[PDB]
Design a binder for this molecule. Sequence first.
Ligand SMILES: *[C@@H]1O[C@H](CO)[C@@H](O[C@@H]2O[C@H](CO)[C@@H](O[C@@H]3O[C@H](CO)[C@@H](O)[C@H](O)[C@H]3NC(C)=O)[C@H](O)[C@H]2NC(C)=O)[C@H](O)[C@H]1NC(C)=O
Ligand SMILES: *[C@@H]1O[C@H](CO)[C@@H](O[C@@H]2O[C@H](CO)[C@@H](O)[C@H](O)[C@H]2NC(C)=O)[C@H](O)[C@H]1NC(C)=O
Ligand SMILES: *[C@@H]1O[C@H](CO)[C@@H](O[C@@H]2O[C@H](CO)[C@@H](O)[C@H](O)[C@H]2NC(C)=O)[C@H](O)[C@H]1NC(C)=O
Ligand SMILES: *[C@@H]1O[C@H](CO)[C@@H](O[C@@H]2O[C@H](CO)[C@@H](O)[C@H](O)[C@H]2NC(C)=O)[C@H](O)[C@H]1NC(C)=O
Ligand SMILES: *[C@@H]1O[C@H](CO)[C@@H](O[C@@H]2O[C@H](CO)[C@@H](O)[C@H](O)[C@H]2NC(C)=O)[C@H](O)[C@H]1NC(C)=O
Ligand code: NAG
Ligand code: NAG
Ligand code: NAG
Ligand code: NAG
Ligand code: NAG
Ligand code: NAG
Ligand code: NAG
Ligand code: NAG
Lengths: 324, 324, 324, 173, 176, 171
Amino acid sequence: DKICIGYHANNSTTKVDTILEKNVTVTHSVELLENQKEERFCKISNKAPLDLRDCTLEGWILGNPRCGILLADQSWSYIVERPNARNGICYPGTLNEAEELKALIGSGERVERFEMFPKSTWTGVNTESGVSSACPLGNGPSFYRNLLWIIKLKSSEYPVIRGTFNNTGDKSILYFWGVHHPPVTTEQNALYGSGDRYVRMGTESMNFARSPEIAARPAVNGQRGRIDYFWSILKPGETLNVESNGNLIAPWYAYRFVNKDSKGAIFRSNLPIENCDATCQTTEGVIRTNKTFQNVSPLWIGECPKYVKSKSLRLATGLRNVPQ
Amino acid sequence: DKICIGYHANNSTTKVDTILEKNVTVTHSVELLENQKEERFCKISNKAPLDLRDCTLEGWILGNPRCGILLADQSWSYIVERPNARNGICYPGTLNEAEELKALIGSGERVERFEMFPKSTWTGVNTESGVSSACPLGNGPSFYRNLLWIIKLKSSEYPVIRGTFNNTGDKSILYFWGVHHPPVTTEQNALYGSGDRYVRMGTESMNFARSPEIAARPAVNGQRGRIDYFWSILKPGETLNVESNGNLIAPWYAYRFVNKDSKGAIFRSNLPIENCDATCQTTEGVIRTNKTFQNVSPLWIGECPKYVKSKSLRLATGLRNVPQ
Amino acid sequence: DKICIGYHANNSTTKVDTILEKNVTVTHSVELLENQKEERFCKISNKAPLDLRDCTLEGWILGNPRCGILLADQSWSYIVERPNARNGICYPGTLNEAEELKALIGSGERVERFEMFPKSTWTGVNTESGVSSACPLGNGPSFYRNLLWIIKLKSSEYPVIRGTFNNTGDKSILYFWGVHHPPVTTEQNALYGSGDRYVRMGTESMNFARSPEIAARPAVNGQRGRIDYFWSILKPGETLNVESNGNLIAPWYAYRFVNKDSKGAIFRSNLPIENCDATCQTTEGVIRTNKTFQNVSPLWIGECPKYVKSKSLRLATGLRNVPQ
Amino acid sequence: GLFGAIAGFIEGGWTGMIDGWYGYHHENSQGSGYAADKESTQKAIDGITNKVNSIIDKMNTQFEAVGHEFSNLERRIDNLNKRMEDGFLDVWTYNAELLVLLENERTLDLHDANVKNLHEKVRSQLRDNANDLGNGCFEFWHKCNNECMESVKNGTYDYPKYQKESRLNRQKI
Amino acid sequence: GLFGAIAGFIEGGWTGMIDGWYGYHHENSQGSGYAADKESTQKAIDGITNKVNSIIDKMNTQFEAVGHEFSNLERRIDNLNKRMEDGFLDVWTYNAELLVLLENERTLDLHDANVKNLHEKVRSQLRDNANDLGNGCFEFWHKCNNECMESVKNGTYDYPKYQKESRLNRQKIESV
Amino acid sequence: GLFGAIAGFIEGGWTGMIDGWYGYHHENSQGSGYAADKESTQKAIDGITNKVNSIIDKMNTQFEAVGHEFSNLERRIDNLNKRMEDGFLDVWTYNAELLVLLENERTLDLHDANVKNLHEKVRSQLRDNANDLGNGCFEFWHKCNNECMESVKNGTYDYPKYQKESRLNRQ
Ligand SMILES: *[C@@H]1O[C@H](CO)[C@@H](O[C@@H]2O[C@H](CO)[C@@H](O[C@@H]3O[C@H](CO)[C@@H](O)[C@H](O)[C@H]3NC(C)=O)[C@H](O)[C@H]2NC(C)=O)[C@H](O)[C@H]1NC(C)=O
Ligand SMILES: *[C@@H]1O[C@H](CO)[C@@H](O[C@@H]2O[C@H](CO)[C@@H](O)[C@H](O)[C@H]2NC(C)=O)[C@H](O)[C@H]1NC(C)=O
Ligand SMILES: *[C@@H]1O[C@H](CO)[C@@H](O[C@@H]2O[C@H](CO)[C@@H](O)[C@H](O)[C@H]2NC(C)=O)[C@H](O)[C@H]1NC(C)=O
Ligand SMILES: *[C@@H]1O[C@H](CO)[C@@H](O[C@@H]2O[C@H](CO)[C@@H](O)[C@H](O)[C@H]2NC(C)=O)[C@H](O)[C@H]1NC(C)=O
Ligand SMILES: *[C@@H]1O[C@H](CO)[C@@H](O[C@@H]2O[C@H](CO)[C@@H](O)[C@H](O)[C@H]2NC(C)=O)[C@H](O)[C@H]1NC(C)=O
Ligand SMILES: *[C@@H]1O[C@H](CO)[C@@H](O)[C@H](O)[C@H]1NC(C)=O
Ligand SMILES: *[C@@H]1O[C@H](CO)[C@@H](O)[C@H](O)[C@H]1NC(C)=O
Ligand SMILES: *[C@@H]1O[C@H](CO)[C@@H](O)[C@H](O)[C@H]1NC(C)=O
Ligand SMILES: *[C@@H]1O[C@H](CO)[C@@H](O)[C@H](O)[C@H]1NC(C)=O
Ligand SMILES: *[C@@H]1O[C@H](CO)[C@@H](O)[C@H](O)[C@H]1NC(C)=O
Ligand SMILES: *[C@@H]1O[C@H](CO)[C@@H](O)[C@H](O)[C@H]1NC(C)=O
Ligand SMILES: *[C@@H]1O[C@H](CO)[C@@H](O)[C@H](O)[C@H]1NC(C)=O
Ligand SMILES: *[C@@H]1O[C@H](CO)[C@@H](O)[C@H](O)[C@H]1NC(C)=O
């Protein structure tokens, strides 16, 4: 008659690492790291992401004429931008504070597109024929859908034009405008006129004035001229006064902006968007797990496990497995 | 006859947490985290803080006429700014590089207020009558006490005016100036004159130039015109040359600046400043403790315990309490 | 007859610290922290660093005439600038985005110096006599070797001058230019002329335009005038158009640029550069060790041990030393 | 450190005990069998579960990198942002990887200590009524039936009850 | 890592021993009483004091957030500063909270080991001159006065001195 | 915690045992000597080597500060960069210094456990065939030759072989 004290053993071949010894077989363990992903984009919080498709972010928000598929109100859980999108800023020039613009929009939830200044705002001028071959739609010349290129009538001078927008809404307004820099004095006199010309934009918190800098630049899309693009935020209760005697690329349509109450994301990716739902969406794909860590990507939206470089993080729960 | 080996027990109900077990009653323990604060501001290093009262930081150093209580020599341990102080930049406009200025002043300990350019510096112009209802002193209209608004005599033209300050002291000088932007050309010609006008400042290390940007703006404090405010540091041994043919808001009084040899602070708070002393001053109040951690605030100036999110950090010192 | 169980002891007096006890003598231990350095600079990956000697980074890359020994092709593993080098920006003025320039070059490996615009590029103007006593070479006045100071012909006006460079290589081109700001209107008329003057640079991705800002400034290096220096990168396949009717400091020589595929470094130090080899090169000197940590410097190039403040980090390997 | 039981003086584990981590094997006139000690096993499960849950809970925040963009004139703050993102990545990678190594050790040693304590608990009841074989087994100096075995496992073993039968078997040998 | 003594084979603690953490309770003709072992107790006190001080000492630096302000066109570096400050806050919270959990375990286990070792220390001297009750107590097979009691705690117990008297009293009580 | 052996019931170490960390000293008619325990010494070396290597390997990344420069109008991002660099410096200093304290404790205790376990391994075989002096030594109740000593070290000591001879010595 005898009694023995002993411990459990089983058929586990699962191994963990310890400080004193590596690859130790244990009876029970739990994996904390997730390395599996679905390579695709799904919906976050029952909201579809915005695919910018063949348009860049600037091309979308400025209304590049080939971006018509996007020309509407937009509500996104997040934004997917495609690496090689062809439709950007079609007419050559710099958008001032471009990176800050992307950060603002990325921090957004929804934008509502509306007409800020109708063509009837600007009187004594040609509101048509504001197009260029640099911004083609099909073969024919066109222009941005959120901007109005105003040129002088062939008959008269370019009169002082004025516009006013009082933001009486509760929502901030994102709007855009520009200053045209024709390549030669010929075009400046033909499009707007001689003498000192000006573009004047202002609100309670902003004062903007510029004059044309006439210069011949290397050709981009057949253009030696340039447009300096600008963007700004008209706060609720603020009012915008526009004053110009020439070279104004006027705000036409603008956006009422809705701040996202959490972190937003803009993903640069080739992955397909499908009809699916996700709690955790990374730029590399969807993660579905109850695990604590993940091997997929540092860039994500929603509720994701912590990103680490580890290939495995396995906690021992059971004991050293010693079968007989 | 017998002898027994055993361990201490007491009347303690104090509990600590362990990795294997929560709520373990132990005989002796020490709390490492401090949650207590005196909601008030005291002196750091026996030097009183500066209460900005009803003035914003910009309103103070620019010398808003309603900030008169603050326009003098100041030596502070730290600065307290009140959330809703009404007296800011009274005449509408942008302070250029405002946030860097706030950062500079926060890193300072003392300023000495002195008259840099007396009114007699600018001759052939009206150095009086440079006041506005937007910047009232008492009931009557006025202007900043560190700035001089120069307007043209109608008798003569606006002459090219010049001023010079050679900084022969050991202390750096913080000074301010501005460019006036009238709402309409009428006022520009009436206050300064026709043609291209300019404001030009220069030192051994700085070169500054601007021209008036005339624009029609929404009224702020009864003013549709604007002033672009600027600030700079005149290093010891450096010299400032001022040259302008119009639209100049000239430096009047300035501050000799003394850099703090350690971290300075600017607190946004409603808490009362009282007659007391503190080693550790947070933005949420005073901490008096020997403890290693605190959950009160990440923002503080004196010698404070490390900030964490924890509700409690209690180390076991004695043993598991097991009374019989 | 007897047998005893026991443990090793020796003459070791080496001590380690534990959580329960300090100064504990152990039989065997290993020091993980390295405090030793060779105060000098060696080769990283068998490639020598660039010694800037008596020239500042700006003075070198702009081509200060006293920096001639460095005006050639250069290949560096890293760059050493000497604290008090005399040859800097000799003609007084600001290098725009200087810190971004230093950061870019630090991320570089090699520069190839070539002539971008020869003096014959600019027609109707004087390309000689473009020198100053502020930038002396020997006793005679001189100027930068990468810049051309263009002045009006004695006989004719300053014509609109133009230049074009098409970058057909695979490497980006680093180039420099400037705008001269005379102290008084007199010199402006004498060197360039009256009326509106401009300096205009443009590429497919860049738009630059400036005007002269005439102002009286304190003398620096015998000069009350200033030059605003600028730098930019001509991308492969891009084109630079230069357009000016005056006040232009023209690009002359530029650099073909090679981007470093890893982090580069710029050390500001007096330490000697020698022909030797190092795996780990800090700004304070060379570290040769198998140890895991070092207290020498946070700033280094190559493969270095982790930087900490510790004086010693010694792990016990053997046991508590208890001689008989 | 090692408590000497697991892969120690008890040379191996039992694949025949499937209901618990620590337990018994008995032999008598009524046959043999394995039985898990449910008290010590459950206490271990509660402790390990708490350890795992507590570790997960302290790891329950995330540093979140963002996809913000920087111009060619923003190289410094770009590089700053990257060194920060890599900075916290390395700290949390270190924390996670090292915590797993150290605590896996502690967990395995914990099981060892539990087996050891269980072995001494039994040794203490039997005293000289049983022969300690040094391998974790005890030979009884008396007949120990199923109920007798239960009392040992359940910890209610009556020592003086079997003492005389035990000593007479030590006397005759 | 339990050493099996505290809330172990020694089932409970003594509220009657107030001068130390670990100690003795004796019984003889001269009466009973509690006495702390000052050696093992003092050594533990030094160690725990050292642990707490060392922990406090390594926690003796602070990440200090600042109240710098950023414009509406500085959104990126504003968020950068915020993610950094929250970054170290989460790191130090992790470090602090987890360390308290882990080391509280160690400290409690340490006391357990001390009680166990003190117990083995006594058991080693008494050998078969005393009856191990398994609960932490030893019944002497001989008369042990105060001077005898002192030697046990102090570790100078004379085993062969009591050997003969003890062996006769194991024989006398057994029925063989 | 302490396992009670090192500087414990075994009061001191042996300067005479040079071939290992843990071991034996034996005495009989064939002479005397120190001998390292071959099993436990190697296993301890393997574990500690693994511990040291594992620690070094987890410390095998570096936060690298840069020598980037900032203008007088960049004071905020300058200070941002400094607080970050000092931030990680303080984190890693904390980690390194505290890890050394905690693991040095563990390493010393590891040896202690190894010595105790080595002592119980021997105590368990000898049983009542030997007299436990409590200081780590065992006096044999029978003649124990060199091969007998070896059997103890191998952990193969034959208890019933010497059982009767030991027991008969009762004065
Ligand atoms: C640890 O070991 C012993 C625990 O009691 C102590 O040694 C005994 O201490 C006695 C008490 O002081 C000593 O007293 C001697 O004997 C009688 C007491 O019976 C005294 O009156 C005498 O003055 C004194 N000397 C003589 C010659 O009688 C004894 O020396 C001793 N007894 C025996 C049997 O050894 C140690 O002192 C103690 N160490 C401490 C407390 O530090
Ligand atoms: C979280 O998920 C894990 C793994 O996805 C689940 O793990 C299991 O725990 C149960 C406990 O009874 C075991 O029976 C399973 O065998 C475990 N899974 C594996 C793969 O071994 C776990 O169920 C989930 N969390 C909870 C609380 O149940
Ligand atoms: C540990 O101790 C805390 C003491 O606050 C216990 O907290 C109570 O638990 C109940 C539910 O069990 C909850 O209402 C609250 O968390 C507490 N109630 C109070 C303070 O009135 C907790 O239950 C204990 N056990 C754990 C956390 O497992
Ligand atoms: C760095 O290399 C040295 C070799 O010079 C290592 O030190 C040796 O380690 C062996 C193995 O324990 C000893 O026998 C030698 O006596 C040691 N030589 C010394 C200390 O000078 C050292 O361990 C290495 N360090 C690291 C961190 O890898
Ligand atoms: C030393 O110990 C080993 C085992 O640890 C002994 O080898 C064993 O010998 C027995 C026969 O008595 C076999 O049943 C085992 O299978 C052997 N073990 C192995 C691992 O093969 C060895 O004989 C011992 N040496 C001496 C001199 O006694
Ligand atoms: C191991 O044995 C168990 C019990 O029968 C069962 O899960 C299966 O047979 C084996 N497990 C695996 C994963 O093969
Ligand atoms: C331990 O880890 C894995 C086991 O799956 C293996 O890749 C690795 O090579 C092992 N290490 C050694 C030293 O065998
Ligand atoms: C805009 O409308 C509001 C109505 O609330 C009015 O009070 C305000 O004066 C208007 N702004 C301007 C510039 O007229
Ligand atoms: C008894 O306990 C109370 C609280 O539980 C404590 O404040 C007190 O100091 C203890 N000792 C006493 C009352 O002697
Ligand atoms: C004033 O500046 C001039 C140079 O413009 C020079 O004499 C000196 O730096 C200053 N004067 C004195 C007396 O220090
Ligand atoms: C150090 O080693 C020497 C030489 O073996 C020996 O005397 C002793 O172990 C130590 N020396 C002293 C003076 O303690
Ligand atoms: C340990 O060694 C040095 C000796 O100066 C010092 O750190 C300290 O005084 C010593 N003692 C302790 C307890 O640290
Ligand atoms: C630059 O040169 C290339 C020659 O390979 C030519 O194809 C391209 O059109 C040129 N770009 C110009 C002239 O703008």
